[PDB]
Amino acid sequence: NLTDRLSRTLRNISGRGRLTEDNVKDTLREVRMALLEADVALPVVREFINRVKEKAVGHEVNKSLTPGQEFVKIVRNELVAAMGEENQTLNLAAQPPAVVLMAGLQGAGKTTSVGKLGKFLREKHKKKVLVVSADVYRPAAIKQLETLAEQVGVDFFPSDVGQKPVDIVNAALKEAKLKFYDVLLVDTAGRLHVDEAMMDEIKQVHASINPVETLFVVDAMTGQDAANTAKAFNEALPLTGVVLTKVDGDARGGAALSIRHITGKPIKFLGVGEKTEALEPFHPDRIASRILGMXXXXXXXXXXXXXXXXXXXXXXXXXXXXXXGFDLNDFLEQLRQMKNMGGXXXXXXXXXXXXXXXXXXXXXXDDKVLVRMEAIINSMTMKERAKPEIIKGSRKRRIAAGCGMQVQDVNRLLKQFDDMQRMMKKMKKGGXXXXXXXXXXXXXXXXXXX
RNA sequence: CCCGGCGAGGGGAGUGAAAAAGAACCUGAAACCGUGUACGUACAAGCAGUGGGAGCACGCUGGCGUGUGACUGCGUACC
Ligand SMILES: Nc1nc2c(ncn2[C@@H]2O[C@H](COP(=O)(O)OP(=O)(O)NP(=O)(O)O)[C@@H](O)[C@H]2O)c(=O)[nH]1
Ligand SMILES: [Mg+2]
Ligand SMILES: [Mg+2]
Ligand SMILES: [Mg+2]
Ligand SMILES: [Mg+2]
Ligand SMILES: [Mg+2]
Ligand SMILES: [Mg+2]
Ligand SMILES: [Mg+2]
Ligand SMILES: [Mg+2]
Ligand SMILES: [Mg+2]
Ligand SMILES: [Mg+2]
Ligand SMILES: [Mg+2]
Ligand SMILES: [Mg+2]
Ligand SMILES: [Mg+2]
Ligand SMILES: [Mg+2]
Ligand SMILES: [Mg+2]
Numbered sequence A: 001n002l003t004d005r006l007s008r009t010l011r012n013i014s015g016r017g018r019l020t021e022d023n024v025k026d027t028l029r030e031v032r033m034a035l036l037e038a039d040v041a042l043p044v045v046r047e048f049i050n051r052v053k054e055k056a057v058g059h060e061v062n063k064s065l066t067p068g069q070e071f072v073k074i075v076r077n078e079l080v081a082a083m084g085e086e087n088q089t090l091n092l093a094a095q096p097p098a099v100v101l102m103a104g105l106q107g108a109g110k111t112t113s114v115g116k117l118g119k120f121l122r123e124k125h126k127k128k129v130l131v132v133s134a135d136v137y138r139p140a141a142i143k144q145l146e147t148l149a150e151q152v153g154v155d156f157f158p159s160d161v162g163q164k165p166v167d168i169v170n171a172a173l174k175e176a177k178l179k180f181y182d183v184l185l186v187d188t189a190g191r192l193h194v195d196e197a198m199m200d201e202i203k204q205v206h207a208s209i210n211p212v213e214t215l216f217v218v219d220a221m222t223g224q225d226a227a228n229t230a231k232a233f234n235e236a237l238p239l240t241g242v243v244l245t246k247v248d249g250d251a252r253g254g255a256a257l258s259i260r261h262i263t264g265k266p267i268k269f270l271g272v273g274e275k276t277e278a279l280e281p282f283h284p285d286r287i288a289s290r291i292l293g294m295x296x297x298x299x300x301x302x303x304x305x306x307x308x309x310x311x312x313x314x315x316x317x318x319x320x321x322x323x324x325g326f327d328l329n330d331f332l333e334q335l336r337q338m339k340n341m342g343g344x345x346x347x348x349x350x351x352x353x354x355x356x357x358x359x360x361x362x363x364x365x366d367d368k369v370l371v372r373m374e375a376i377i378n379s380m381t382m383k384e385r386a387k388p389e390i391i392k393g394s395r396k397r398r399i400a401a402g403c404g405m406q407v408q409d410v411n412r413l414l415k416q417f418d419d420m421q422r423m424m425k426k427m428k429k430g431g432x433x434x435x436x437x438x439x440x441x442x443x444x445x446x447x448x449x450x
Numbered sequence B: 001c002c003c004g005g006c007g008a009g010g011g012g013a014g015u016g017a018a019a020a021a022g023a024a025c026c027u028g029a030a031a032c033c034g035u036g037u038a039c040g041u042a043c044a045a046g047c048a049g050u051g052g053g054a055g056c057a058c059g060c061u062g063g064c065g066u067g068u069g070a071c072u073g074c075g076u077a078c079c
C-alpha cells in the first residue's frame, strides 16, 4: 500500500510552491522507505529512488509548475520505461505454432497462470490450446491442471508421476504437432533457483521441447531475492519474459523491476485475481498508475471490459426501452448484467475526477448491494416492475418481507431507480455531447465540502 | 415509515419538562369565519329588548339551578 505513503509523499510535494531540494530529498527517502515497506528488492529500491532523485532536479512545466506533478509523472513514467515501456497492447508475438513454458519458485502462481493464459488466448486467438503438467513432484498438481483445463474449456494432455518430465513434454509436443494445435501451455514444478538437479532437469526439458517462450512467474510479494532468482533462472533456463502475480494484494510487486533490471526481458501479464478470468495484459502505466491512485490506462481498460461483457445486455436494455420505455425490467436486466462484471476497485480507478473530491476509502460492496437489488426487484410482481409508480406502503412491506430485508432499503432502491429513470429520460431527449457536457459538479458554494 | 407530483401540506415515529413550543415557532384577547349538540323558527309585520309566560332539553336532591322562549303587556337607537 504505497498510496498511503506515496500519497502523503507526492501529495506533500504537489502542495509546496517552488519546492526546496530538501523536501524533494525527504520525499525520495519516503519513496525509498515506502518500497522498503513493500519488500521490493531493497538494493533496487535504492537504485530506483536514486534514479528518481536525479530525474527530479531540473524539470520545468509551463502548464503547471507544481513539482508534485513532476514527482508523480516522473515516478510513473520511470517505472513505466523500467517496467517495459507501455507494453500492454503488444504482449507475446503469436506464430502458427506456439510453445510457452511457465517457470519459477514454489507457489508463485504458475499452474493458475497457465489456465488464465489458456482462457485469455482462447478468447482472443479464436484458436485451439493444449496444456500439460511437467510436475510429477507436488501432490495432485497434475489433477489441478486437469481441473483448471476442464473449467476453461481447453484440451488436456494426460500425465502421471510415474513418468519423466522430458518424456511427458516430448509426448505432449508430438501429440500437439500431430493434432494441429497452436498455443501450448506447459506448467512446470516450482523449484529453488539454487537446486541444481531440478534446474538441470528443466534445462533438459527446454532442450527437448524447444519453446519459443519461457515465462518466469513472480509473486508480487517477492522480496530482495528476486534479482538473484531472475538472474539464476535467466542464466541456466534463460527466460524470454515475466508474469507478475497476486497484484490484487497490497504488495507493490516492484520486485519484477529488479527482475527486469537483470533479465531485460519484457513483463507480459498481470495476475489480478484467483479466478481464471483474472489474467490482464501487464502494463507499466497501469501498475504505476495503480500505485499512484489515478489512472488513464486502467480507466479505458475497465470501461472496455465492462463494455465487452455488457454489450448485448445494454443493447437488450436499449431495445426494451425503445419498445416499452425504461422499466424495472430493463433496470433489473441491467442489475444482473452489472452484477456479473462487478468489482469496486476497477470501478473507482476508472474515474479519477470523482476520486479527487471524495475519500479513496469510499467503497460500495458490489457483491452485496447489487445482489440485494436483484433480490428486491425479484420480489415484485411483473406489473410493479413495468409500472413502478404504483408501488406503495403495503407493497414495500411485501417486498421487504420477501427478500428478508428492511422497507427502508426498498425505498432506497426505488429511489435509485427513480434517479436512473430520470437519467435515462435526460439521455433520451438530449444530444449525447450536450447531455454529457451539461452534467454539473455541484458545490453549494466554491468553498469546499460546504 | 406512510399519502402525495422525487411537490405543497399532512399523519405517525424520535428529541425535548412541554412539539395545542415545529422555525407561518412565548403568552395568543376581540372583531371575523366555521364544525357539533340543546332549544326555537316555514299564517308572520316594526330600534329586536323589558314585564309575564307554556312547553322541551340538561344538571341536581317531587322541588332548585342552566340553556331555549311558543304566546301576550309596554316599547320609534346612541352622539
Ligand atoms: N489472489 C490471487 N491468487 C492467485 C493469483 N495467481 C495465483 N493465485 C493463487 O496462488 C496459489 C498458488 O498458485 P498455484 O497456481 O498453485 O502456484 P504454482 O506456482 O503452480 N505452485 P507450485 O510451485 O507448487 O507448482 C493458488 O492458491 C492460487 O489460486 C492471483 O493473481 N491472485
Ligand atoms: Mg503448480
Ligand atoms: Mg414534507
Ligand atoms: Mg419524552
Ligand atoms: Mg398564527
Ligand atoms: Mg419562556
Ligand atoms: Mg403560539
Ligand atoms: Mg385561538
Ligand atoms: Mg378565539
Ligand atoms: Mg288568514
Ligand atoms: Mg305557525
Ligand atoms: Mg317582518
Ligand atoms: Mg320573566
Ligand atoms: Mg338529567
Ligand atoms: Mg327548573
Ligand atoms: Mg328555566
Ligand SMILES: [Mg+2]
Binding pocket: none
Ligand atoms: Mg318577549
Ligand SMILES: [Mg+2]
Binding pocket: B075
Ligand atoms: Mg321608551
Ligand SMILES: [Mg+2]
Binding pocket: none
Ligand atoms: Mg308597537
